[PDB]
């Protein structure tokens, strides 16, 4: 998934495949992991996986999932949204190794 992605946003809820984010250059991704099995799948050549700490990205992901559940009337997304405070920590954030210094928002504290 997201092979050679260059820009945009891709929110993924659930298990990921193998070799996820292979050759990623730009953009930003979010993954809703449940068993910490992501490090055994993602390719760590040019990307890094971390946790969300800044309130800005938290709010962005919140608004994206809110619009998604408003659009498709999906019950699982609503179950995620109602438990936002608990389930916010399970999310992994995947960021390329090129936007570490070019991002307008500091990705790291």
């Amino acid at each position: 998934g997201c092979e050679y992605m260059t820009g945009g946003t891709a929110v993924i809820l659930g298990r990921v495949g193998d070799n996820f984010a292979a050759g990623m250059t730009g953009g930003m991704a979010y993954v809703y992991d449940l068993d910490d099995s992501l490090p055994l799948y993602i390719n760590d050549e040019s990307v890094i996986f971390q946790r969300i700490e800044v309130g800005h990205y938290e709010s962005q992901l919140k608004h994206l999932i809110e619009e998604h559940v408003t659009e498709t009337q999906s019950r699982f997304a609503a179950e995620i949204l109602n438990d936002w405070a608990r389930e916010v920590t399970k999310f992994w954030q995947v960021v390329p190794k090129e936007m570490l210094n070019r991002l307008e928002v500091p990705v790291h504290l």
Partner: protein, 470 residues
């Protein structure tokens, strides 16, 4: 006579919490006459009245609404009582914010609900206050023996209707003061003990014979009852309890809600029992905890704050919105000075044969599924202890044991324990035995018992005449 465009809604009266926390008197004083003319005029006489559809007894509201708006209280009272027995108490007890005053089209338009309950109460008190009230004796008394088990609202309504029909009915119950649990269960803080004694006096005036202080489960048996009479109607009501078996339960200073309520309110109104000062059902000014979320818990915390000064809390597993009681009741309770805990459940009763505290957890409710249920899940994040010496186990009711224990090896019931009746005739599995009240449906309201009692009386009359045709 629409009116609601310009005039604004306003309840009759509300005594502040300064003097209310002490006495047992009502909270709502009676309704004013100019206010009667003004607020009754407020309705819109809405075609296709939704207020009638949602009312479980389906009485013709807009008729007497317009009448009282114009006066003519005599025919107004006549058309008001022609359809619904026990008008005062049914009007004052109905959770109107969800039954009738919760669907008036003016309320859906956010203008406010027509104060239908207060109009019913007022039109039925003024009518009695000037002697425009008489019993209903049957002309050309046919003469037959019929029996009713249980003096609840359903039994009393069926008895009054059958006495108006031309029969001779006998009322069997377990208590000395007739009138169902109205005189024992419902607190006087919300229903004073004058209207009930007045209405039961009117009943006895019509020519009904009471069998007070009996126990049909012990004093006699259903075959003897049926042999003495021509038809019997079982309306014994529900009186069992559901308790918990948490670690450290069953020890001292725990009790059910019903007994504490009945003694420490009604028998203390009569000043007879000693358990108010002998038993632990007193004003232990330390603390009080109440489990459950039904209306029983609400009246329990109300009467706990009334009886003596204490600091009380309430524990309930669901959320505020799914609570079955009236949201005006919880508002009054919060005004009195009670503290609520939402979405929590008790897991342990810590003590040394005396309850020192309660260990509870916090649960969470997911999103409702297709059927509409919200599954609960414990969190484990915050399991806390709350300090108190007495907890009240108000967890509702459920059908007792009726078939085997009470009288009859031949009596069909469902898995719920409640029995079954026909949607048309209300006749049970056994002939000559009809049912009504809360036995058939479970824990329900008063007006439902009234409707079931009326239907049961009609079916009883029909079946009796059909059998006597031979």
């Amino acid at each position: 006579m629409l009116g609601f465009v310009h005039t604004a809604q306003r309840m009759p009266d509300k005594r502040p919490a300064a003097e209310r926390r002490q006495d047992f008197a009502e909270i709502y004083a009676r309704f004013s006459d100019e206010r009667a003319n003004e607020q009754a005029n407020r309705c819109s006489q809405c075609g296709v009245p939704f207020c009638q559809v949602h009312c479980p007894v389906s009485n013709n509201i807009p008729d007497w609404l317009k009448l009282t708006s114009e006066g003519r209280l005599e025919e107004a009272y006549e058309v008001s009582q022609a359809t619904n027995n026990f008008p005062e108490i049914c009007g004052r007890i109905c959770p109107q914010d969800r039954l009738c005053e919760g669907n008036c089209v003016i309320e859906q338009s956010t203008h406010g609900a027509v104060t239908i309950g207060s109009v019913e109460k007022y039109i039925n008190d003024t009518a009695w206050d000037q002697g425009w009230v008489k019993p209903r004796t049957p002309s050309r008394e046919l003469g037959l023996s019929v029996g009713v088990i249980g003096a609840g609202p359903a039994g009393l309504a069926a008895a009054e209707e059958l006495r108006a029909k031309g029969y001779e009915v006998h009322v069997y119950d377990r208590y000395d003061r007739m009138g169902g649990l109205l005189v024992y269960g419902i607190p006087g803080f919300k229903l004073e003990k004058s209207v009930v004694e007045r209405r039961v006096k009117l009943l006895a005036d019509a020519g009904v014979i009471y069998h007070p202080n009996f126990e049909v489960g012990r004093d006699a048996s259903l075959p003897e009852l049926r042999r003495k009479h021509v038809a019997v109607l079982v309306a014994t009501g529900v009186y069992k309890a559901r308790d918990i078996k948490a670690p450290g339960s069953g020890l001292g200073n725990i009790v059910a809600a019903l007994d504490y309520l009945t003694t420490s309110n009604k028998v203390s109104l009569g000043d007879t029992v000693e358990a108010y000062e002998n038993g632990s059902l007193n004003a232990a000014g330390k603390h009080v905890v109440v489990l459950g979320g039904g209306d029983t818990a609400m009246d329990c915390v109300r009467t706990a704050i009334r009886q003596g000064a204490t600091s009380v809390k309430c524990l309930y597993r669901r959320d505020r919105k799914n609570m079955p009681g009236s949201q005006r009741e919880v508002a009054h309770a919060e005004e009195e000075g009670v503290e609520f805990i939402w979405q929590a459940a008790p897991e342990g009763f810590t003590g040394d044969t005396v309850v020192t505290g309660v260990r509870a957890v916090r649960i969470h409710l997911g999103v409702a599924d297709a059927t509409g249920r919200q599954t609960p899940q414990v969190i484990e994040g915050s399991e806390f202890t709350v300090q108190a010496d007495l907890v009240i186990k108000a967890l509702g009711f459920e059908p007792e044991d009726l078939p085997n224990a009470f009288d009859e090896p031949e009596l069909k019931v469902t898995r719920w324990g409640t029995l079954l009746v026909d949607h048309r005739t209300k006749m049970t599995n056994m002939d000559g035995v009809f049912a009504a009240g809360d036995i058939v449906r479970g824990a329900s309201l008063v007006v439902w018992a009234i409707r079931d009692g009326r239907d049961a009386a009609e079916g009883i009359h029909a079946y009796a005449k059909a059998k006597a045709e031979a």
